[PDB]
Each structure stands twice: as structure tokens, then as C-alpha cells.
Design a protein around this ligand. Structure first.
Ligand code: NA
Ligand code: NA
Ligand code: NA
Lengths: 599, 599, 599
């Protein structure tokens, strides 16, 4: 009797009060403690050394308590700890042990999920300092770390970096560094209000699998000039990806340094997301120095169905090499994305592009092995004032990239700056189904729509089709004499081109090559013999040794004669056709022709 | 001893029974009440004034109890109330205060989520009456309402409107009216069995953000002739959207009035959903009178990867103006959708269309500013009997819309009714990669496949390519004399067209314009001079002053002569070519030619 | 006093300890038991006949306990049973009653969800035996079974089939057989480590609705030679689908027998998933013997945005018939998928294909009714050594299929083995926007890129466009004399084709048909008359009665004359053109021409 009150008021008391589910005679006879033991919260470990519960807050470092929770539940084979709603839980110190090396705060462990319903906020302790809030490595050296398996973070809660700036550019900052991560995920969480390098990294140098980020929000995660670089999510293990996320920045600096996602390993995806205020949408890249876990090929890379306002490049391709590994990038699809360059002055941020073939980090452009890339069904728009805007900026070696059924409304279709890199290009394919918009019409004085500033182009197709007039452009497509061209097909549709002085320009007359197939409009002057009847007409210039046929794009205003409808050429480089003189006399005309070579 | 039994049986008793998580010496020493206080249900507030629990049911209005729950949890900084499974909770009265003005039942509040596992059902009180079940405004005037933040509704439960009809057309009915809503969502819920205006509205006139509807079901939400209009989900704040939802109607009235989604603000999306039995798939629209919260441009509008059986129009574009605001719609992508018009009699429901450029609500067609729209990679099908079916019904001013790589199998490709609106059209682009199906072949007597009933067309491309014969159609494309045409490209591929009397028709000979680029097949009669040898042939008609070249689409059955392969023209409007007379004599032939102008 | 201790220690004790939510004076006065009664776990039913809790494990069959849980909660109108984390719950026996007939273990019931957080593992009892772990039928005969409604399985847990092989090929094995299933779903679960037929089947012969599988993982679910066939998920009710799943196999046998998904009913989808190591991506099929629940048409079938490495066919189409039902398949879209055939020897697994039109299960190829299929915006790749690789293997009757804007890099574009089936083909459309890759260049000796081994082709379009040279191929497109051709358009673009001996081959001269529209390059020898001036040239061969026009694809090396630019024909089958002799004399030349017929 007397001792019973004692048990009950004691910590063992719920262990002495019996329960049976809904008075069901078949249900287990248990104690209240057992049913309470089926869930677990931060409250169960957020206490002083006497077991008295401590209230979280500005002046309480909840780090050790959350760590004890994770360590204990890890002890029992796993489960899910709730971080309670209606409370803000401040972290005010570094973790210890193997996460020491990673500037860790909290160590994640296998099979221990966190359901974050409340808010987690970083304390001023962390101002001007590196940090990585959650860390799945168990060792300061990642090569010697064990794995993190079956760890899920989710809920409706928030993680907040307290608005503190970086202290030096050299510092790193992360939200969730899963480590060598297998079956791990972040779902539903808001990450906000910081200056960090990443919010989440999945995998480490290819080690890991089936990691995902889904329905999270990323807001204002760069805020100072000191921050050297940002990629919100870093997918660095295969069979992993990001979907249905929302990414937003408002800092000027973000527009210069910040990317939403990097995909660095095979079978990874970025889908169904919305981006605003970033410099870059996605890096898709095989880095040789991150190839230890999952081979040296990144393949099956998908970027689909995203919405974006960016200030530089939507999708950046790349590959590179190290002393002993060579990186390859192949089998990539980019489709269904709708993307625009936001309002900004020309040249005020990295050069705007839907696709960029970037050089490596040291800036080498002759190490890349990028091929079998499919860009299809996307739309891109840049405002008319943005000189530095392009469907593709092709700044490094390219072994293939195929464009079909896109809509591009910007300054250049193909661009590379002259006298910079001289890319070697193979298997660039620009199908005629790509629609070229008109927003930059009349803006293109001194400029070439496809400006082919390359070392050489082979096995490529450029099928230019305009949709409106732009008589300001210097040419539709220009190849400088420095660029070799062979086994390629280059064509300009005559629509909207009749008043153009130059349609296709080959500055080293490269269209003469044995295996070059071209067609484009030009104005030609002809003069006939004086014979009544069937009568030949010849070009006055001799620039046409390469032409296999030509046909009229002009009406004939004359009654007493007609020039030929079609032409071929002669050894001396003249065009020749058979027209008709109703009445005799030497004729002289200027006609618009479609010139054709092997097509 | 004596008093102890008293405490324990009392409401404070669980506050006196100690608990420690799994007898762990490091875990907090708590009371049972504390752990029970970590969750909260309707059961905790569904009681009489004495604290005795009340059973929900047909004759119990659970409204006040749920409201007390929400108000209390709101009190503590938020959390999640469970609406328990295995029970139906009837609502039988209006809410009070600021939701009064919105016909509100339950008021939502910030950070208070509802996990709906059971069923919520409307009582007969609400028959023939307006209602809005859940309401995030705090004020009857929305302009003076505060915000709703971080409010999520989810679970496997059901909301049921009890099958009651509208009382008058003027009435409104909604399920979740989030109000000025920021980070709010509805996930997993079934909405069923009613006659309402919307099931869910996100945002209010552009105020709000990051609102979503995901994996919900909408079933039989229109059922009477009195219901004036329905849109199941109304996205009226940016960075918001609908995905992976299911929408179904079985009412005849739904096929005339009901739309699945309206997107009314920037950066919004509708994806991965299935629709059946509706009139309309989606409205995508900038309404000037809903532009107070997020500017006057709707841009970054995405409709992707949906499945639909509808009776009218899949995607409706629009923009309009008010005295002081002008609405603009730009940067829209519609792709990957597979859509069909369900079995119905011709003209039995609003005119079937994949895309409709609709006039404003007053029916004005000269106020719209719609451009940079990309329609790609969709398929559309209407059954052969449905005269009123079209890839695009272009009923109002259009400043651009680009079609690429679609498959359209219906009655018209481009349509507008004659002598209705006279749209001004710019930058309409119909790429040759659009495939035209054959289901309506032989159904097109007296009809034009592309029936261009416009005030004028500029900077547009129509590249017609058939895939099968339809000799019933009057023409492939017809421009009435009333329609101006300039700086456009119009072409008809000869495949399947050889037996066509008319391919392209220009009723005011608009193909003669300086900047009009065309090509299409026609039959022409020619007669030659009698000269042996090289000999000219001339058209007997003089309708060809506009032709720059023509070429044969016919074989030559003759041995003693051949007509020219290619033709040009003369000032008098004749065609002329140089053929060959092996033996002399005047020749006369009818040939099928490809006529070409500046192409 | 004395009796009170008794109550409290007893199973009714929590029913005597009072609780009030957060000491709120307005909250219900309840007992602890009531709040505990709001959740329910396996622990509440995993006891001996005395109510003592039993620990799960290798030597404990948890089947009867889980079944009692489900039966009881079913009793109360539904709810969610947690299968606890940190524990493995072994199943060691068959269920009884109506699931007896289906080799059932656990019977599912309506409104009873399972939240699987721990692991469920099959005991050795099941080695070499059939089994179906979860079963929604209530009757051994499915035609007499009731329905399963509102049943959801989800969590972060695992289902594991213990690695046991099939005992005989005739046996069936499943994970979740939902039965006649309406609003049922599987979310988040890993299925692993077995030898089964399916992991999940939704619906039964068209009965059921709104069933989905989302974010699940399927790993190593085939492991022996005895397993006759595998499809991981079997969607057999409408308005149902699979998304964002991960499928992986490592068994050799899987590459020969295993498919990731079959869609067998209308309005079903397969999206956003990743596949590795399987033979097949998806079957999309109307089976007449599975048409009792939802009609005989499968329509609105979507396969979108998936990533795959497979060894046979990505998407298999089919339809078939029974004595009294005829199956139809129409309105299908396949887009945005990126797919490759994994490294393997040629012919080492079923013939690699992006699309396969397969014959029925008995192998009949004349029963199918497949039409309105849209394949767009996909990429496909097979390694260069894989002879047996194709964009489409067209092995049975086809009533339509449309390809647009794809990238195909494999051995064949269109293929069927000769002297096997002789498919009747209608409305096959291969748009010019399809890009043909170069990986198999130089591998195609004795082979035809489009090898049209059909009974007949009508209303079809093949627009061949190469992107690089392959002079190893016998032809770009070949029609054997056995194949009829009519009302079709067949064309070969001259780019990369100038050195080809054969471009298009018609072995029964089928290009002569009245309604056949073609164009392709050929080399032709001509000789002229000796006349000075305008002078005709004629082909030495008489194979050209069908040509309507031709034009030069060669330059003219000569000065004293030029051959005609364009040609027509004569009754005797010669080509004839008018060229020019500056100086007289008989000329003789070999030119590359574009031959054209009615285009
Ligand atoms: Na060079
Ligand atoms: Na007009
Ligand atoms: Na035949």
C-alpha cells in the first residue's frame, strides 16, 4: 500500500499501470510504459543530470541531448526521433569524435530517422565559423568512414542557419552531409536563412545509393561576398536524385556564385523543381577525383520538367581527368524545362546560357569526353538587352550533343568567344525542329546567330530556320577560317532571309570540302548570251566551283525573256543555267538563289 | 494514501505517474501526461461542458469542438491535430467571426496542421446553402485579412459534401480556401460527393507562396444545373501547384461547366495528374483583377504529363485588363500530355480543343497579351464524328504560340469561326514535326484543315504535312480575303495531296506579298512552241506572277518529248520552262507542280 | 484502497488514471487508456493465450498475431497498425480461409492500413513453395471475391523473401496482391531478396481503381533458372500507376525473364522511375482474358521520364483476343525516357529494342489492334557490338505508331526478322526529327538500317536523315519484293550518303506505285547529243519510268559544257534534261542525283 504510491510516482510507475488495447480480451496485457516506449522524442533526452526536463531556447545548447537520443535509439536497432513542433531547438556547440574533422554538430546514425516538426536554429557560437549540421561520417577521414544506411529526415519543420556570414572563403558549411550514404532521404523540410556551401550532400565520391531529396525548400542560403561557391544539393552517389523541390535566393551574390543542384554520378536526376534567383540551375559532371565509389562514367543523367529564373547557365556539362583516372559523361537527357534569364544588365553576371560546355576547374578545355546528350522540348528566354545569352555556350571539347524540338529566344544559338578556347567539336546536331525566337531581333549588329568559334567541326548538323526577320545580324552562321569543317551538314532556310546580305559565311571557304553538305540563299548577278530562244545565263563572279545546284528565289519581272529556274556550275567557278529569250538580246539580272552543295 | 487515489482518478492523475523511456538511466524523468501531451486529437476537445466525451454522428455538430482544438494548438505555437480514423465527424453549422463573410465553417490557423484520417461530412443544414469548409482568412474582407502560414492538411481521410445541390447559381462553395497562404498544402485527401465551385483555392489575388496539392482525389463535385461554374483547384499565388492528383466527374453538367485546375499566377504548375469527365483540363490565365499580390504577369506556367478525357478544351489561355492594370501571359510550356475528347455528339458540349485562346469573361478578344508559349510532345485525339474538335481554337488576339513535335488527330488543326471574332495573330509557329492524324479523314466536306479566320497573320509559320489522304477536305489551308498576311511562311508538303483540287487557298491572293514565303502543289496546263529541240513551255493561265520557281510532280508518259523539269515565270503571270522536243510539234500537257515563292 | 492497487496493476488500470490535455480546462476529461487506444501496433496482438507479449524472431511465426490485429481493427471501421521499427517479424505459415486458394499468408482488409517500419521476413517454411504475402481477396475464386477499399501500406520498412528459390516453374509468388482493389497504395517500402513472379499486383482483371505504387524499392527479386517469368508491378485496374520507384536486379536470369512493370488497363502510368539489370522496362498491353472489369480497350497509357539499363525491350506493345472478347490498345504516349541496353554479347539475351510490337503469348501476330501511339523525346543507346538492337522491332500487325523527336543510337531503326512473321503495317510514322546516332557505324555489313520485312505497308512515312557516315550498311532502307507498299512517303536525305551504292532499295520496284511518294540519292550515267548550245542529256539506263524529277548532287568539273541541273523522264524509262554545250560534241557523265517521285 505504502510502497505502491512510491513506485507509481517514481520513474518506474507507468511500468506498473496495466493497459489492454480497447479492453480487447485477445490483446496483449501490457503496461503503460510499453506503449509509451513505442515512440520517442527529444523530450525523452533533453534533461539535466538529475533527469529534470530542460526548456529549449536562445540560451540552451540542445546539441548533446539530441546526440544522446540518436546514440540510444541507434542502440536498439533504429527508429524515429521526433523533434517537437511548437519549439525552436538551438544548437550551440560542435560535436566530437569522428565528425570533429567535418566541423560536425550532430552525428547521424544508421536506421535512426529524425522527424523534424519544430525548428532547429544555429546559435551565435557559429557566426563566422564553418559548420556541418548533420553528418553521416563516423570518421574525420572519409576514406576510412563506415556507411550511413536507412536514415531519413522529414517532417514539416525548419532548419535555419541564423543568417551568419562566412568568416573566410576557405570555410565550408553544410546542412545535411549524409556521407557514404545508402537509402537515406530528406523530405518536406525547409532550409533557410544562411551563408553556406551546400544544404545537402548525398554520397561521397560515388559511395552510396538510393539517396533522395523531395519536397524541401531552400531559401536565402547565400548572403555575403565571402562565400566562394554554392550548390544547394550535391548528388554524389548513384541511383539518387532531387524532385519537386523549391529553391530561392534574393542575394546579389547568389546570382554570381549559386547553383541549385550538382549531379556527379550515374543514374541521377533532377526533376519537377522550381528555381529563382540563382546563377545556375544544374552542374552535370564526371569529376575524376570523385570517381572512387561508382566508376569514372557518369551516365543516365536526367534534368527534366523544371522551372527556372537564373542569371547564368541552366545546365553545365563537364568532365575531366586526374593523373590516374579519366572522367567521361554520356547518356544525358535535358527536357521539358522552362527557363529564363532574369532581368539584368548585359554582362553583369556569368554569361547566360541554356546549355554550357564548361572547361574543367583549372580552366582546361581539351580534357573533356562528353557525348550522347539529348536536349529536347525545353524553352528558354532571355530579355532583349542581354547580349550574353545563348542556347549553348560551347567552350570546351565536345564529342556530341543533340538538340531537337526546343524553343530558344535569346541572343546567340551557338556561341563561343573568339580567341579564347578552341574547342574540338564532333556530333553537334541542331535539328530543323528547333524554333528560334524573335525577342533579340534588331539587336544583333556585328553579330552572328551561330558563331562557330571552334578549332574544328566534324559530323555535325546545323539546320537554321528563322521564324521572323532580323536584318541586324551580320550572318545566320559564320565559320572563321581557323575552324576546320568536314563531314557535316549546314543549311539555312530562305524564310525571312531574302533581304540578308550574308546568310552563311565560310571565311576559309570550308563549304568546298568533299564531304560538306550545305545550302543557303545568296544574291547572284547573271548575264546571258544574245541568242533568241533557249539561251544560257552565266554568273559574272566565279565564286561557285563548289555548287552542285541552285534555284531561283526571285520572280521574273520581264516579259521578253526569263532566266533559268535552276543552275549548275562550270570548272571556272561560274554558275550556268538554260533560260529563254522570246526575243534575242543580251540579258543581265540580279537574282536571289538558293545555292546547294550535295543536297 | 487516501488523497492519492483521488489525484489519480482525477484529470491530473497521469500527471502523477512517472515514466522514463525504456528504463534508460539517461532519459528524462517525466510523467505520463507529458508524453500524452506530445500528440493531440479531436477527442481531446470533443466534449460537453463537463468534460465528458461526446460521440460524433449524424445528430452531432462537431464544428465547435474542432474549432476549439485549432484555437488551442494555435495558442502553443502550432502542431498537428488528428481527426481520428474509424469515425465520421459531421459539421452542422457556420463558423463565426472573420470567416462569417466567406460562409466559413472551420477557421484554419497558422502552424496548425490537420491530419485527417477519418471522414468529415456536411450535415443537411448546409443543403441549398453556400459554404466554405475550411478558411484561412481571419477577416471577412480579404484585403484586410492576415496571412495563413505553415498549414498542412493531409492523411488518408475523406471530405464529403453530402451530395447537396446549390440553392442558387450566385452561391459559392469551397472545400479548402487557404486565403493569403504561405507554405500550406493538401496531401492524400479525397474530396467527394458534392456540388461546389472549387474544392481547394490556394492564395488570394497573388498573395501567398509555396502552396501545393498532391495525391488528392476529386470525385463527383458537380451535380446540378444550378451550379454556374467549377474549377476543382484554383492556384492563385505563385510558386505553387498541383501534382499527381486524380480528378473525376460523372455528371452531364460537369462536361459543360467543369475545369480541373486554373493557374492564375507566376511559377505555377499542373503535373502528372489524371482527369476524366470534365469539360476542361486547365485555365492558364493572367486576370488583371487578381494581380494585387504578385504583379500583372503570369509567367513560368507549366502543364505537363497529364492524362485526360474531357469534353471541351484541355488548356485555355487568356489575359485581360482593368481600368488601371493590364494583364500579360508569357513563358508557358505544355508538354507530354495525352488527352482525348470523350464520346459525345458533335456540338453537344463546348467546342473541343487541345489549346483555346479564349476571349476575356465579358467576351472581348482585343485585350489579350499572350506570347512565348511552347506546346510540344503532346498527343490529342477526338472521335471522327466530332466536327467541333481542334488542335487550337484561336478566338482572340495572339502574340505568339509555338507548336513542335505534337500528334493531333482531330477535325481541324487551326480553327476560328468565321464572322465571329477577328483575332490579330503574331508569331504562330506550326513546325513541320507536328503529325496530323487520320481519324477524321473523309469527314471534312466543305471544311479547311487550317481555317485561318483572322484579322491578320504576321511572322507566322504553318508547315502542313499530311500522313494520309483526305480528299474530302476543301483545302489544307485557307485564308479568306479578309485576313491580311505578311512576313510569314506557309507550306504544304505534296505527300498524300496529288488528287487534291485545292491545297493552299489565298482568297485575296495574299501569297503575292513581298515578304510571304510559300510552297504548295497545283495542277497546271501548259502548251509549247513547235520547235524541234530545246523548246519552251508556257502555262495557259496567267495566275502565277508571284511564283519564283516550280518543279514537276508528274511523270512524263511521252517518248517524243518531255516538258521542263522546272519553271520560272514572266511579267504577264505565265509560267515558263525549257523542255525538249525530240520531234517537233506543239505540245500540250497537264502537270502537277510544286509552286514555290521565295523558298 | 486495497482494491484500487488491484485495478491499477490490472489490464484495466490505465482505464482508471485520468488525463486532460495539457491541463487545459476545456479539454475532455479522459483516461490514459483512451489516448493509448488512439494508436495500435503489432505489440498489442503479439501475445500468448495468457496475454503475455511474445518476442518476434527466427523461431517465431508472427502470422496469426498480425492477422488478429488486422481482423480486430477492421472490426472498428479501420485504422493503421504499426509494424514496429528495430524488429524483424518472421512469417512462418499459410493463412487460412479465402486466401487459402491464393497461397496467402496475411489477409488484408478494407480501411486497415499497415505502417511497416520494421522488417518482415519469410521463414524457411516457405523455401521451394508458392506464396503471396499479403492478399486482398476474401475468396479463393477471384470472381466471387469482395473488394478491398482504402488499404494503404507504407513506411520506411522492408519486406524480404528470404532468398529462397522457386520449387517449380509452375508456382506463383507475390508480395502484395491487392485483389479487387479500390483506393489502395504501397509507399516507401523496400521489397528485397527473393525469387518471385511479382512484388505487387494492383487490381484483378480490370476490377479496381486508384491504386498506386510510389517510392518503393525492388531489389534482387529473381534468382533462379526455375522462375518462369517476372513483372515487378502488375497494374491491372484503371486510374492506377507507378511513380518514382527504383528497380534493380543482379541475376543473369533477370536479364532474360524480368520486366519492371506491366500496364494492363486504361488510364495507367509508369513514371519517374529508375531500372537496372532487367530484361524489360514495361509491357503495355490489352489482354482479352483480363477485360472483365474495365472494358476491352486499354487507352491512356503513359510511360514517361524513366531511366533504364535493360537487356531486351524497353516497352512492349500488344493486344490479343479470346473466343468472345477482342482486345484493343490505343492512345499511348512514351516520352522523356532515357534507356540503354547494358553491356552484353550480341544475341545473348532477348533482342534489344526501344519499342517492340510483340505477338500474343501463343505467338500469333495477326490478332493485334494497336494504334494512336506517340513515341517522342526519348533517347536510346546500345553498345556497338550489339547486332540485335533496334529503335522498333515490328513483329506483329500494327495499326499505327508515331515517332517524333527521338534520338536512337543502335543497330537498326526499323527491324523485323525475315521469314518469320509478316506483319500488316498501317500508319507507321517516322518523322525527320528523329536523330540517328553513329555508334554502330561501320558495323552494318550486309544489313539494312530500316529493314522493312513486312507483309505490306500503307499510310506510312519514313523520313531517313543520317547524322554521320556509315558506308558499311547495305542500304538505308530496303523493301523486299514480298512487301506491298502503297499510299506512303519514303525519303532519304542526301547528307552523309554521297558514297553509298544503295540508299533506298525497292526489290519489287514498289516505289512506282500511283500513290507512293519518295526521294533518294542515286548515281546515274548520262550521254548527250552533240549539238552546240542547248542540248539534251539522257540516262543510259531505262530504270526511271517512275521519276517525276531529279536534280544534281554533283559539281561539274568541265568548262566546255554543263549537264542539266534538273531532269524529268520519258516513256521508255530514261531520264532527260536540257544542259549546255559551249562547244559541240557528245558528252558522257556520271552524276549523283536526287531522284524524286511526286515530291
Ligand atoms: Na583549327
Ligand atoms: Na483584316
Ligand atoms: Na505481301
Amino acid at each position: 500500500p505504502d510502497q505502491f504510491r512510491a513506485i507509481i510516482e517514481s520513474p518506474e510507475g507507468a511500468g506498473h499501470v496495466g493497459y489492454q488495447y480497447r479492453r480487447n480480451t485477445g490483446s496483449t496485457m501490457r503496461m503503460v510504459s510499453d506503449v509509451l516506449d513505442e515512440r520517442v522524442s527529444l523530450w525523452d533526452f533533453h534533461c539535466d543530470p538529475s533527469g529534470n526536463v530542460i526548456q529549449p531556447g536562445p540560451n540552451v545548447d540542445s546539441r548533446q541531448y539530441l546526440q544522446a537520443a540518436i546514440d540510444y535509439v541507434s542502440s536498439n536497432g533504429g527508429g524515429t526521433i521526433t523533434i517537437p513542433a511548437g519549439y525552436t531547438w538551438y544548437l550551440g556547440s560542435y560535436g566530437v569524435g569522428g565528425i570533429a574533422g567535418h566541423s560536425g554538430i550532430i552525428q547521424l546514425r544508421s536506421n535512426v530517422n529524425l522527424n523534424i516538426e519544430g525548428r532547429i536554429h544555429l546559435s551565435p557560437f557559429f557566426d563566422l565559423k564553418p559548420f556541418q549540421v548533420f553528418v553521416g561520417f563516423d570518421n574525420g577521414d572519409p576514406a576510412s568512414s563506415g556507411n550511413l544506411e536507412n536514415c531519413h529526415i522529414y517532417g514539416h519543420g525548419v532548419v535555419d542557419f541564423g543568417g551568419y556570414e562566412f568568416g573566410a572563403s576557405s570555410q565550408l558549411r553544410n546542412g545535411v552531409a549524409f556521407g557514404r550514404s545508402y537509402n537515406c532521404s530528406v523530405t518536406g523540410i525547409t532550409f533557410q536563412n544562411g551563408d553556406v556551401t551546400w544544404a545537402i550532400t548525398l554520397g561521397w565520391n560515388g559511395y552510396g545509393s538510393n539517396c533522395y531529396v523531395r519536397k524541401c525548400r531552400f531559401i536565402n542560403l547565400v548572403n555575403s561576398s565571402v562565400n566562394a561557391n554554392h550548390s544547394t544539393v550535391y548528388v554524389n552517389c548513384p541511383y539518387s536524385g532531387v524532385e519537386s523541390c523549391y529553391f530561392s535566393m534574393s542575394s546579389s551574390f547568389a546570382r554570381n556564385i549559386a547553383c541549385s543542384v550538382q549531379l556527379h554520378q550515374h543514374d541521377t536526376f533532377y526533376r519537377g523543381s522550381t528555381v529563382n534567383g540563382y546563377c545556375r540551375g544544374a552542374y552535370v559532371v564526371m569529376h575524376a577525383a570523385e570517381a572512387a565509389g561508382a566508376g569514372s562514367y557518369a551516365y543516365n543523367m536526367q534534368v527534366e520538367n523544371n522551372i527556372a529564373v537564373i542569371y547564368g547557365q541552366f545546365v553545365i556539362l563537364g568532365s575531366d581527368v586526374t593523373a590516374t583516372v579519366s572522367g567521361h559523361l554520356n547518356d544525358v537527357i535535358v527536357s521539358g524545362n522552362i527557363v529564363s534569364i532574369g532581368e539584368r544588365a548585359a554582362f553583369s553576371a556569368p554569361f547566360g546560357a541554356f546549355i554550357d560546355i564548361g572547361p574543367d576547374n583549372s580552366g582546361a578545355s581539351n580534357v573533356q569526353d562528353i557525348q550522347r546528350v539529348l536536349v529536347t522540348g525545353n524553352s528558354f528566354y532571355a530579355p532583349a538587352n542581354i547580349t550574353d545569352s545563348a542556347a549553348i555556350t560551347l567552350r570546351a571539347n565536345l564529342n556530341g550533343c543533340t538538340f531537337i524540338a526546343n524553343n530558344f529566344d535569346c541572343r546567340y544559338m551557338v556561341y563561343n568567344a573568339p580567341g579564347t578556347t578552341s574547342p574540338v567539336v564532333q556530333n553537334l546536331v541542331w535539328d530543323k525542329s528547333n524554333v528560334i525566337g524573335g525577342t533579340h531581333a534588331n539587336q544583333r549588329a556585328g553579330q552572328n546567330l551561330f558563331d562557330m568559334q571552334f578549332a574544328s567541326v566534324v559530323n555535325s548538323t546545323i539546320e537554321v530556320q528563322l521564324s521572323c526577320e532580323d536584318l541586324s545580324m551580320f550572318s545566320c552562321i559564320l565559320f572563321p577560317a581557323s575552324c576546320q569543317l568536314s563531314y557535316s551538314k549546314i543549311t539555312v532556310d530562305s524564310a525571312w532571309t531574302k533581304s540578308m546580305s550574308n546568310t552563311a559565311v565560310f571565311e576559309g571557304n570550308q563549304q568546298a570540302g568533299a564531304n560538306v553538305y550545305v545550302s543557303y540563299p545568296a544574291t547572284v548577278n547573271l548575264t546571258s548570251y544574245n541568242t533568241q530562244g533557249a539561251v544560257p545565263f552565266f554568273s559574272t563572279d566565279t565564286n561557285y566551283a563548289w555548287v552542285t545546284s541552285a534555284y531561283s528565289l526571285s520572280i521574273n519581272e520581264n516579259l521578253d525573256f526569263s532566266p533559268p529556274a535552276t543552275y549548275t556550275n562550270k570548272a571556272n567557278g561560274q554558275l550556268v543555267g538554260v533560260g529563254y529569250n522570246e526575243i534575242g538580246g543580251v540579258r543581265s539580272v540580279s537574282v536571289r538563289l538558293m545555292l546547294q552543295r550535295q543536297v
